[PDB]
């Protein structure tokens, strides 16, 4: 559960370049032999994505911010990648989305899971029936409050260690849209020595997860190796195969999706990448002819918002009213009309010079930004037990017989010792 790996070593988050990845179908709508323009959370082309790899003395399982969405890409031989953990705290404090492929089927669950230092899945002691079926469940210790569960079709996962170049390529897309989580996937063989292949790919939806939870961080799960001959301390002495997984960030960008006769995308263009791409976006075409075209308009954004209001002087003496030598009786309460002046309420409400202060129908903060039509001040002195009677819809010796506030009273009551 919480046992740290012996050979794990931290490495700096090195970066790389992505050529044409980050493209996926925004919706199930079908289109063919057309160039469609759409804006959604996308990974910009030629962007920077993290450089992570798994070996027997550097194990990569860092916590990465999710933000509005991320992109995944990895080159595999034995499919070392196991799954992911999605959530805000990645702990039982809140719900976390987790996807685990434990060699029989893809399992998606939304519950309150207990966080672990190094969550993952592995297998041990295979011997003469290759197996590679999930053995231990370190992903989480306990679960509760499950609001969603899903199961995919059964299948067998091949974790055989293979020599040569990387024969497999897996790329997924993870995004949140008003709490709606969408998953895209793509699988294609490759012959790769290092880094990523030069080419284009299109990712298709995997499942639909209308969950509706806030996710700000996520983890990448890895599959390690175990054997009868070279085991280790539980569970620090376990090792995993060779793999490299890369994580990107999605941004609200507009792409020109070029659809073939069968509807598959063969090309993509990002407006913000290249001014030539800006020309293509403006023309809504994948070909640009020799010439000068107007794509958009440039503008200089304000540095900061500057407010210069006129002098607020000539204030009516509210302080004198509150500090006047004498006040009228509760029955003889004076009705003071205030107009033809400015009111500075910052010194009154926020000075904390009075015992109690409350407002009805409007918060004191909003009153500072509002312009009124008529303002009246009613000054009176009453006993402590009678202060509670000053409110809309009250009764008593003061509320009914001396001074009554209407149920729709939008003013405020001020009192002090």
């Amino acid at each position, epitope marked *: *559960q919480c046992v740290n790996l012996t050979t794990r070593t931290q490495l700096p988050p090195a970066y790389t370049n992505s050529f044409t990845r980050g493209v996926y179908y925004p919706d199930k709508v079908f289109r063919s032999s057309v160039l469609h323009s759409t804006q959604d959370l996308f990974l910009p082309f030629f962007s920077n994505v993290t450089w992570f790899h798994a070996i027997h003395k550097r194990f990569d399982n860092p916590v990465l911010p999710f933000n509005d969405g991320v992109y995944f890409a990895s080159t595999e031989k034995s499919n070392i990648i196991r799954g992911w953990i999605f959530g805000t705290t990645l702990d039982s404090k809140t719900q976390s989305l987790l996807i685990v492929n434990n060699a029989t089927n893809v399992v998606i669950k939304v519950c309150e899971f207990q966080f672990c230092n190094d969550p993952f899945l592995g297998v*041990y*002691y295979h*011997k*003469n029936n290759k197996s590679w079926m999930e*053995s*231990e469940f370190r992903v989480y210790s306990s679960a509760n409050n499950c609001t969603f569960e899903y199961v995919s079709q059964p299948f067998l996962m091949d974790l055989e260690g293979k020599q040569g170049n990387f024969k497999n390529l897996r790329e997924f897309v993870f995004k949140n849209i008003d709490g709606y989580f969408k998953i895209y996937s793509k699988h294609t063989p490759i012959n790769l020595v290092r880094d990523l292949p030069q080419g284009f790919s299109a990712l298709e939806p995997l499942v639909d997860l209308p969950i509706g939870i806030n996710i700000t961080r996520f983890q990448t799960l890895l599959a390690l190796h175990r054997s*009868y001959l070279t085991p280790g301390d*539980s569970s620090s002495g376990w090792t995993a195969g060779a793999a490299a997984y890369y994580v990107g960030y999605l941004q609200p960008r507009t792409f020109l999706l070029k659809y073939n006769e069968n509807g598959t995308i063969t090309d993509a263009v990002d407006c913000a990448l290249d001014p030539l791409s800006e020309t293509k976006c403006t023309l809504k075409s994948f070909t640009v002819e020799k010439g000068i075209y107007q794509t958009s308009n440039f503008r200089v954004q304000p540095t900061e918002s500057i407010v210069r209001f006129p002098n607020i002087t000539n204030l009516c003496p509210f302080g004198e009213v509150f500090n006047a030598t004498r006040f009228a009786s509760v029955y003889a309460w004076n009705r003071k009309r205030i107009s033809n002046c400015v009111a500075d309420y910052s010194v009154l409400y926020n000075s904390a010079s009075f015992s109690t202060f409350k407002c009805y129908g409007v918060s004191p903060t909003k009153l500072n930004d509002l312009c009124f039509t008529n303002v009246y001040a009613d000054s009176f002195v009453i006993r402590g037990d009678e202060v509670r009677q000053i409110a809309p819809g009250q009764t008593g010796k003061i509320a009914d017989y001396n001074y009554k506030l209407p149920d729709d009273f939008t003013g405020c009551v001020i009192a002090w010792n």
Partner: antibody, heavy 119, light 113 residues
Framework: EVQLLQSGAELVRPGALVKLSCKAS????????MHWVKQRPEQGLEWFGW????????IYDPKFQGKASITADTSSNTAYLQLSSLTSEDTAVYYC????????????WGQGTSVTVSS | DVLMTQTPLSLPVSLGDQASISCRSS???????????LEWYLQKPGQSPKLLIY???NRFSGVPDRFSGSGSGTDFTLKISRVEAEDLGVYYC?????????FGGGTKLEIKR
């Protein structure tokens, strides 16, 4: 020195259940597997199952499948065994082994417990 | 489920003689890496079984150097260089790794006279 401690003997009626404890001393219960074994005089030992306190996964002898459940305690450093729906055929001596460190080359055994199921 | 058989049921050996106990398995327990999965247990009178050998080729810590195993495939034999008075008991064979573990029929040892 490590030692595995178990109850000396136990006696229950048919159809009842027995709760057995195997104490861990001198080693970490979480990081080491725990095994169980049953012995009878006629044909010797019979395997029962294994459990990992860190994980909790359990496998049972096809004969005992559905007949028992295994549990372990972390704080107490003691592994528990439970048998249900006991019958006359369940009379035997039980043993526990562990301290594997994910390796076969390392294991011990306790003095065992004598369990008799009769009326 | 793997079935294991042992023979002979018992054998006498005078002090200083060599003892041979063999075990048979219904399925191969050797794999690609070349090592073997088997453990030898000895149960002394009034005492529980204790490990003797692991992998058939490596001796368990604290065990006398007289105890050693050898073999290949599904056929193996436990060899004791010099049997002493403390070797009385029953010898067992164990199938390890990740599979329903199997036990042997048992082999008893006694001193000759």
């Amino acid at each position: 020195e490590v030692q595995l401690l178990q109850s000396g003997a136990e006696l229950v009626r048919p159809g009842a259940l027995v709760k057995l404890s195997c104490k861990a001393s001198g080693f970490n219960i979480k990081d080491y597997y725990m095994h169980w074994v049953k012995q009878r005089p006629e044909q010797g030992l019979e395997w029962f199952g294994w459990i990992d306190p860190e994980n909790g996964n359990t496998i049972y002898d096809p004969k005992f499948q559905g007949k028992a459940s295994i549990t372990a305690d972390t704080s107490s450093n003691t592994a528990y065994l439970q048998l249900s729906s006991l019958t006359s055929e369940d009379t035997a001596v039980y043993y526990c082994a562990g301290s594997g460190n994910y390796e076969d080359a390392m294991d011990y055994w306790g003095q065992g417990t004598s369990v008799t199921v009769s009326s | 489920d793997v079935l294991m058989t042992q023979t002979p049921l018992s054998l006498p050996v005078s002090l200083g003689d060599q003892a041979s106990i063999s075990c048979r398995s219904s399925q191969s327990i050797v794999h690609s890496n070349g090592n073997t999965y088997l453990e030898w247990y000895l149960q002394k009178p009034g005492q529980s079984p204790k490990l003797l050998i692991y992998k058939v080729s490596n001796r368990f810590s604290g065990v006398p150097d007289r105890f050693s195993g050898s073999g290949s495939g599904t056929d193996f034999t436990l060899k004791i260089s010099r049997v002493e008075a403390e070797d009385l008991g029953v010898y067992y064979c164990f199938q390890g790794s990740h599979v329903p573990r199997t036990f042997g029929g048992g082999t008893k040892l006694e001193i000759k006279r």
